[PDB]
Design an enzyme around this catalytic site. Structure first.
Site, short mmCIF file in Angstrom:
data_model
loop_
_atom_site.label_atom_id
_atom_site.label_comp_id
_atom_site.label_asym_id
_atom_site.label_seq_id
_atom_site.Cartn_x
_atom_site.Cartn_y
_atom_site.Cartn_z
N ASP A 181 -0.34 41.99 14.63
CA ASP A 181 0.00 42.81 13.72
C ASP A 181 -1.29 42.76 12.70
OD1 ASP A 181 1.47 44.47 11.89
OD2 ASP A 181 2.74 42.93 11.09
N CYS A 215 5.88 50.34 16.19
CA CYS A 215 5.38 49.02 15.74
C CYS A 215 6.24 48.34 14.96
CB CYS A 215 3.87 48.93 15.28
SG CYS A 215 3.46 50.14 13.88
N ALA A 217 6.17 48.81 11.50
CA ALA A 217 6.20 49.80 10.29
C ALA A 217 6.10 51.47 11.10
CB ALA A 217 4.93 49.68 9.36
N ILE A 219 3.18 52.69 11.59
CA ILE A 219 1.85 53.45 11.15
C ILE A 219 0.56 52.84 11.39
CG2 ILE A 219 3.21 54.21 9.08
CD1 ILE A 219 2.07 52.03 7.30
N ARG A 221 -0.34 50.07 14.20
CA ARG A 221 -0.67 49.97 15.67
C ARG A 221 -0.48 51.37 16.36
NH1 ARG A 221 1.90 44.10 16.47
NH2 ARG A 221 2.76 44.68 14.74
N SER A 222 0.99 52.08 15.90
CA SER A 222 1.39 53.09 16.42
C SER A 222 0.34 54.16 16.24
CB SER A 222 2.62 53.73 15.50
OG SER A 222 3.73 52.62 15.91
N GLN A 262 -4.17 51.20 9.59
CA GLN A 262 -4.02 50.22 8.55
C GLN A 262 -5.09 49.42 8.13
OE1 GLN A 262 -1.13 49.29 6.18
NE2 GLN A 262 -1.42 51.59 6.52
O1 OTA Z 1 3.23 46.87 12.75
C1 OTA Z 1 2.18 47.43 12.47
O2 OTA Z 1 1.20 47.56 13.03
C2 OTA Z 1 2.19 47.83 11.01
O3 OTA Z 1 1.53 48.87 10.47
N1 OTA Z 1 2.56 46.92 10.25
C3 OTA Z 1 2.71 47.21 8.95
S1 OTA Z 1 2.12 48.56 7.89
C4 OTA Z 1 2.77 47.64 6.51
C5 OTA Z 1 3.35 46.56 6.73
C6 OTA Z 1 3.16 46.04 8.10
C7 OTA Z 1 3.91 44.73 8.71
O4 OTA Z 1 3.79 44.77 9.81
O5 OTA Z 1 4.25 43.71 7.83
C8 OTA Z 1 4.07 45.69 5.46
C9 OTA Z 1 4.10 46.54 4.25
N2 OTA Z 1 3.00 47.18 3.91
C10 OTA Z 1 2.65 48.40 4.91
#
Ligand code: OTA
Length: 298
Positions: A181, A215, A217, A219, A221-222, A262
């Site tokens: 992550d 993934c 969220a 956003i 990795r996706s 991200q």
């Molecule tokens: O799984 C991902 O690649 C990803 O974007 N994860 C994300 S984006 C994101 C978070 C997370 C997380 O996993 O905690 C926590 C809240 N802020 C945005």
């Protein structure tokens, strides 16, 4: 290759964070009113990650049509993707309902269930052939048919049955198990070997519904996965690596879902993966065998 010169300029000047901040500043902001209704609070995994209203996927359900999922429609590339969060325990039935209703053939999972000591996704598929899952709220049955376990990814064949109609569909589940992550894959080779396995399966073909990519969220990795796939397709259509502007493509994708990619490192990795994948697009099919060998898949 013009993106290769861009890459070297940014890398040598150490500018990845500044470029990524520019992208964040230029990205679209559209309303996400439905996601924020009180009745939907427990359908969202993260308070700061919501689908835009204009591109959200609607469940065909009269009570509540909300799922945290977005349709990314890349018109120039003629490819669409559904990006969604890792399902919650109370949304695993909604997840498979969406797969059914959207006629998806593949699901791409880029996370583990437990990461950094916390639960990032519910266990939404069966672990054993003889222990199927029944989703009573959406009237679907899900059965594990087979799994092909490799060193860093797993491919599963699942049967989804609509209990109302008795019609069944085969779903392919592609599970990348070594991508951290907020991190990047081990190498361009490992990533590209996996992407091309998804491509070769037929799951991205226009005769099926959009592939579902997630993934935790939906956003970070996706977004990295979809950006690389779209850039390589655009380069393929034109056979012109210097007509693809990775930053412009990412901004276009961010019209459909917030926050795609991200970290600055994920952006940097996207460049590397497209630059390396261009070798195959431009006619050297032997690189694909090199990727398989460098990935240690076996
Ligand atoms: O799984 C991902 O690649 C990803 O974007 N994860 C994300 S984006 C994101 C978070 C997370 C997380 O996993 O905690 C926590 C809240 N802020 C945005």
């Amino acid at each position: 290759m013009e993106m290769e010169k861009e890459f070297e300029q940014i890398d040598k000047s150490g500018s990845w964070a500044a470029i990524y901040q520019d992208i964040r500043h230029e990205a679209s902001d559209f309303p996400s009113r439905v996601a924020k209704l009180p009745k939907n609070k427990n359908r969202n995994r993260y308070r700061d990650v919501s689908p835009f209203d204009h591109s959200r996927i609607k469940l065909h359900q009269e009570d509540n049509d909300y799922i945290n999922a977005s349709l990314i429609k890349m018109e120039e590339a003629q490819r669409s993707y559904i990006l969604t969060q890792g399902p919650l325990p109370n949304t695993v039935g909604h997840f498979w309902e969406m797969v059914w209703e959207q006629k998806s053939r593949g699901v791409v999972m880029l996370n583990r269930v437990m990461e950094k000591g916390s639960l990032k996704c519910a266990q939404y598929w069966p672990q054993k052939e003889e222990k199927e899952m029944i989703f009573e709220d959406t009237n679907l049955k899900l059965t594990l048919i087979s799994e092909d376990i490799k060193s860093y990814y797993t491919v599963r064949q699942l049967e989804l049955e609509n209990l109302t109609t008795q019609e069944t569909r085969e779903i392919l589940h592609f599970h990348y198990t070594t991508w951290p992550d907020f991190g990047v894959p081990e190498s361009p080779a490992s990533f590209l070997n996996f992407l091309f396995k998804v491509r070769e399966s037929g799951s991205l073909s226009p005769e099926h519904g959009p592939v579902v990519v997630h993934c935790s969220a939906g956003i970070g990795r996706s977004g990295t996965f979809c950006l690389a796939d779209t850039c390589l397709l655009l380069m393929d259509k034109r056979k012109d690596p210097s007509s693809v502007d990775i930053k412009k493509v990412l901004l276009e994708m961010r019209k459909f879902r917030m926050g795609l990619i991200q970290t600055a490192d994920q952006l940097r990795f996207s460049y590397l993966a497209v630059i390396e994948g261009a070798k195959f697009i431009m006619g050297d099919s032997s690189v694909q065998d090199q990727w398989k060998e460098l990935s240690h898949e076996d």
